[PDB]
Amino acid sequence: GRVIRNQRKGAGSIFTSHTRLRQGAAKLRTLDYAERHGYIRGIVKQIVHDSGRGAPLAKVVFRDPYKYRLREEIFIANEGVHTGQFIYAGKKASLNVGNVLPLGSVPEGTIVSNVEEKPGDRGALARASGNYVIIIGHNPDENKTRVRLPSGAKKVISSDARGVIGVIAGGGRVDKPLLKAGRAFHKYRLKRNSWPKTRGVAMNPVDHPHGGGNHQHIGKASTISRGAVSGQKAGLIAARRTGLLRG
RNA sequence: UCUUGGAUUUAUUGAAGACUAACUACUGCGAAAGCAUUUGCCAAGGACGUUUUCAUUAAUCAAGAACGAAAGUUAGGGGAU
RNA sequence: UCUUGGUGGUAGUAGCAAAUAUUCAAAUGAGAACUUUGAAGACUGAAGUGGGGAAAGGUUCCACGUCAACAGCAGUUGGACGUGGGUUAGUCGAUCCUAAGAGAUGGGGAAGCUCCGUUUCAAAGGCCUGAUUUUAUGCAGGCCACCAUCGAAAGGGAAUCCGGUUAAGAUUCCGGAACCUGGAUAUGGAUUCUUCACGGUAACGUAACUGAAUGUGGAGACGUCGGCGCGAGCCCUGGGAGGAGUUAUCUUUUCUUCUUAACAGCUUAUCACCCCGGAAUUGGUUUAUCCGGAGAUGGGGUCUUAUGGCUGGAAGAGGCCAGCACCUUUGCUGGCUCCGGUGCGCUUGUGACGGCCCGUGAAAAUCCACAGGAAGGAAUAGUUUUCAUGCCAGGUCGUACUGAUAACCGCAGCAGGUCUCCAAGGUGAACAGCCUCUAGUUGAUAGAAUAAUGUAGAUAAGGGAAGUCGGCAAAAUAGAUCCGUAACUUCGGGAUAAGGAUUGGCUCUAAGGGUCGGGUACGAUCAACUUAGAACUGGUACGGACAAGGGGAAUCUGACUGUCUAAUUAAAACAUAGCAUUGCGAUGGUCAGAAAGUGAUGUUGACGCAAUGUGAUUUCUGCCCAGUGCUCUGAAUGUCAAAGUGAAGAAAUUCAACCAAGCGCGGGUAAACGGCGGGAGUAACUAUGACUCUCUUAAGGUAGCCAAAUGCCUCGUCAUCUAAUUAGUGACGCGCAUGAAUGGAUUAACGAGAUUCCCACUGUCCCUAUCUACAUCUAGCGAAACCACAGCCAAGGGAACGGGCUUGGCAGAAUCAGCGGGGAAAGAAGACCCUGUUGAGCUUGACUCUAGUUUGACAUUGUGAAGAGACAUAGUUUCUUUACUUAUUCAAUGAAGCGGAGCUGGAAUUCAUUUUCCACGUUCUAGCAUUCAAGGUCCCAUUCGGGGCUGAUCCGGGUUGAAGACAUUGUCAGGUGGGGAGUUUGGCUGGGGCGGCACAUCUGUUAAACGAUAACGCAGAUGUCCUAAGGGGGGCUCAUGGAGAACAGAAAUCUCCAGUAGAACAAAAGGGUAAAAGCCCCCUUGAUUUUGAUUUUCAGUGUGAAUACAAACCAUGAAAGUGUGGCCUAUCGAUCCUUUAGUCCCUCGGAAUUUGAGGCUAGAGGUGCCAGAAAAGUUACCACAGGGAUAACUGGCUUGUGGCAGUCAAGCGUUCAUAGCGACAUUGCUUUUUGAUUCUUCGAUGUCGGCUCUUCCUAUCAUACCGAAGCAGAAUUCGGUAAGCGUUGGAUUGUUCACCCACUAAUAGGGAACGUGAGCUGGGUUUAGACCGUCGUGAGACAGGUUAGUUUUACCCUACUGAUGAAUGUUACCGCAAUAGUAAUUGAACUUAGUACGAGAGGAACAGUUCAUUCGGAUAAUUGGUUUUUGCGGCUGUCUGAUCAGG
């Protein structure tokens, strides 16, 4: 009869993300006239490390088109992007790794990253390290582009949505064992409080639906309805199937 | 098993992965395992030709090594048949 | 267990015993263990008992006075009491900045208190003018797109040091010497006739050397570890100049002073850079291996100033001395304060590097620089107050003291707790331990004595775990050097494996450095601690104190490191990496919030977030989709609500069709929950069963593993381990009840985990003893628990265990030290068990709901179409989709470039027309891009400048995109919803639970001849059945037997005789019944209506059932009569509500009519727990009220059962009942078995076993004396008197019990609250933690297995053991002995004697002597043990200068 650990996560007190050492939000440049009609040249100044993020972050300086000053945009660095490299962003930009282009102005089978779902949301898709979006189709009439997502999902998005050529740098990061609890400790120390995880079968019945009993066991099906309520969704929620991928 | 929620079949436009038919032979190349679409680059090789050059530098080889179909193993990718 | 207050006994008692320790004198004082001073002795031993601070405290600081209380003794003293005094800042902090975060406003939400939100969807804003007289400077232009505020006395940050000074303040006061900020402001220098400096190739330099808007950059501003290098301070050390110590002796000796701050000038560096140069024969180079044609080495330079040097500060200060003054005011005068060295030293700062990360290790205020070029200034002068000097100011608050064995929190002056800085010498690896210096303390109630029992520390012959649940506790080992080092292994380890040597002192030796250099065959000099070797030496000692691993062989278990139940469980539990599954592509997943223009993940995006399971590596993860869950564009006339539609109705309304999701149907899914069988026949063995068959399955337990922490039986069987093993290990496996990510098997390493064995080692034990330090007595001080009254027993009875009562024993003041038998001692209204119509935690398919979610409808909600959209010259909305935007919604931005038209070029082949299109100034490069923009063109009224226009196309003022009448939101409707809420979870009962129903009933009996009568008494029965099995009438007689008839018999039909019921009557059993109540036939509905009376249950209520009538109407028979269900005794049901029948009756209250409703009378629908709630579990996490009305353990009664006896004598005993036995029977005893009971205790009598220790019984095992024998001897067997005296050591098990190895004279049985826990122990059981197996959906259960789990108090009374003692004239000595206690026990050998006896085989006893066992009482000559004799000697470290002598 006690509020369980996943229900306490939404109150956001000790389960907030640890955001002191992060460099800022990584976004694309704002979709302005220069990117909508031509291109703009920025410069990679630093490739830095973002805390909690597996991917390195490029700091790219553009000239402000309407005032005399410099705008520093924070990009997710694509693999091969180097300091001092010019980055071109706009409809008329070229097919180079690091360049920011609308997806309608881009051929088929092109690998892109930091892809807007809607034109002007400044980067939504394929942002984690090593991830990319394949362009798998164009529907020029009532402009739409079919893309393939890193989960394998096909998705039709707008041709005016912008992506960045290349894959996200930092790939292969989950290819290393952590080997030890301290490396997971320092990994999650700058993400958020979600580790270590006590199992619900190891708790009392007051703490979890899986809690209690004279042996640690579940006792009802771990598969939970989508139409179940908070406190009940502790297991394999709305599972179409279970078990190993074996035919 | 699929099928009036139109299967199978027909047309058009795609995507993906493998494979490289027919030509293909008592034909070729490679130390062998092997190697068959095109083009480019890169290093190599046999045979022939030579009134070039060096002049026994060679033959086979315990130990030692490189390569070694398929299946299989480990970890990613890919996953059409 | 009343409330408040007061007071006792206990009681002058328990105690005032941790932190090594005090002592002598004098002074003061009434009074000194405790105050002060001297002296001595000690300690903290620089991670301090020292010197300061942070929090907290708040005057405790300091002085004077003073002791009533407080300082658990004292007090003259005090952190006490009384009275005062004391905290000084431009520089130290706060103040300021931001951090995680807090929070106004605008705005939205909320009935509201208030919530959200923090730049959001706001008309959110104040700053310089280039420097002056129409200016309190503004009524001039011009710029900034930022957005409250709070938030750190440890982060960031402007600037102060030294010396002196108080009773108490100081980086704050004084003296000297600085520095910073803000302001004003001149002078000197610099700069200008080339207006805004000059030099250097350059890196860069300098005393300056204009510089607005705007932009850019830097600093602020950053992890951790390692070695290296440098600096500071400390340490060590040499010379010299002073002072003190020692000086029988030695010691150019031992100690001590010898200092230089902030700030300032000049210099000084790793790194970095620049110039020249052009490198392979590759060079330079770090402890660490990096660097060089992207220019090395080398040769010149430049720079930062960490840091150091010199100087100023500044010797005048500070220190050490000397001499003279010696109530001198109070000093005066003089001297010296100097020169080195050393280093893996210690601490700290710092540099350049290296390593680590799926971790890459704050922000802001603030300050500076650069870019730019607005603007302004060159001749008796302007600019810079970034050069120097000069002038003024710097507020407010804090500031004392402690920072703890006495200033803080813990009830207190409490052995607890509470953050940090500094940091001497030696030993030594060391910030260990030990000793010492500076500094600090010597505080803690004392004195005397040295009993028991303690606590703390020890030692121990011989044995060496025999102790115990268990090696618990202790001992053993230990540093370093050298040697040696197994299995196994994840190849990293294991590992200090195991084991073995050496070690002191002294005197030497050999190695290992730094400075030192060359001709256009050569060594002075300086310093250090490491290693190796050798001789000599000694009571063979030597890591000499201190400090300091026990090891090995295995098993179970969890990989490891880690975390955890604060205050009983540190684990095998949790976590972990690894593995796997699930959801989710954002108008989304998961989760918040009452709502919201609201949130967490999210400064996020599938290599991610979220939910789970399993738990490293290795190896594997089998089969099952029936169940349940989950899921699926899955089937769309199965079910279906609200709205809506249709019919009928006067209408309310009723009926009908349609009817979304969900459920139903079908599919998928087990690393979802889970589950994974029996029997028979079979091989040329007997069982065994590759195979086969049906029985049900969804599949039938696979690979593996196993009496496992999982196996009941079970201590399973075999082997091994031992003398002996319920232990361990290895096997075996029809496995109560093993098994595969509810993970199976393995596994190196690891473990304060559990277990077995072995070596070492030991007081664990045999078997105890001794020693040291800290109860007793005293002076002082002085509680508490508890207490009906009290305190000697035995027996009886008694609420079945008395201190009191009864009958006996008896019994003499006052006591002290012990002690644990009793006070069913104390501590707590029993946590176990039960009850209560008392709860709570938790679960679920309980009952009833509910947040949320999902689906529909209506509203928001407008504008068009197509319209297989309505009902056959016929319709804007109607069972399908897409068009519009302006509502709504989402999103972004400094609301910047949207939409539509506008020059050319052409692969439009200008078809004389943009039916018609595309391109809108930027892609080698880490530069730069700003001043309403230069240009061009026009006007000013011209003023050294200004204004237009174009450059830069017009027009629409839709910021831009998405989405769209769908989302959203509101209301209602259906579904889902242990997420959450509330509640329930009957009773009786030889305790409760399970079972049963003895809960409403009927027959017989129990039941004791009226009636009534109990038990979970006995044997049974009821919840029905019947249109006849009811009613009436009539005829007949049944069961059974005998005697006869073709098939035909024991049984088929027919005939006769007998037949009192032996048959039948629906169903139990009892009663009843013969021209019937049975059987068969005929006619029927009296099984009807009305409403009373009565009987039985009983209260003389109800209900059920029955009796007899009365009023009718009927049936039947000729009739009398009978019939108001069943031949009689059982066969059943309130109120409320619904429904039907009856009158056509009452009411709808302003009057009606008609529907509808309500009513009156009679039934039905149902309460079986049957006088009638609507109802699942669990609790070992538990709670409360109680209960001895009631279980678990003692006692009591009983004695089936257990144990022990007797009588009788069939029969056994070669013949022979009774030597010894003894069947079939039968009579007893006991209370050490287990039942039976529930009398005592539930405001608690401590629950198993062992250890220890005493006594008692006798039903006698041994020993003594005897009787009997199928007693020749020997050895046995039976029995008597007898409890005097003994009755053991071990292996396994927690055990009791058992079983085995031994030894013995024998290893008898019992009791004493199943003797004995304020005697212990805690292995077991029986709290809370954890694992397994089975069970359960689950929470959870299991007299199943396993592991871990706080054992309190005596000082009171008695009892006991010891010890005093008043009174008897006093005192003293010597005695007596009533009474009480009593103590010795058992064996062997020799001789008897190889004798008696015996055919032999074998083989005694008494007497005698010698010893021994167990017990007891002493004792210490000897032997051993003990050592504070601190007696003598030795040894380590340190200290007293050495020695001697010591601490």
Ligand SMILES: [Mg+2]
């Ligand atoms: Mg809670």
Ligand SMILES: [Mg+2]
């Ligand atoms: Mg809670």
Ligand SMILES: [Mg+2]
């Ligand atoms: Mg969770």
Ligand SMILES: [Mg+2]
């Ligand atoms: Mg956050």
Ligand SMILES: [Mg+2]
């Ligand atoms: Mg986590």
Ligand SMILES: [Mg+2]
């Ligand atoms: Mg995990």
Ligand SMILES: [Mg+2]
């Ligand atoms: Mg987990």
Ligand SMILES: [Mg+2]
């Ligand atoms: Mg638990």
Ligand SMILES: [Mg+2]
């Ligand atoms: Mg739950």
Ligand SMILES: [Mg+2]
């Ligand atoms: Mg559970």
Ligand SMILES: [Mg+2]
């Ligand atoms: Mg588990």
Ligand SMILES: [Mg+2]
């Ligand atoms: Mg579910």
Ligand SMILES: [Mg+2]
């Ligand atoms: Mg071909």
Ligand SMILES: [Mg+2]
């Ligand atoms: Mg793939």
Ligand SMILES: [Mg+2]
């Ligand atoms: Mg009171």
Ligand SMILES: [Mg+2]
């Ligand atoms: Mg009193």
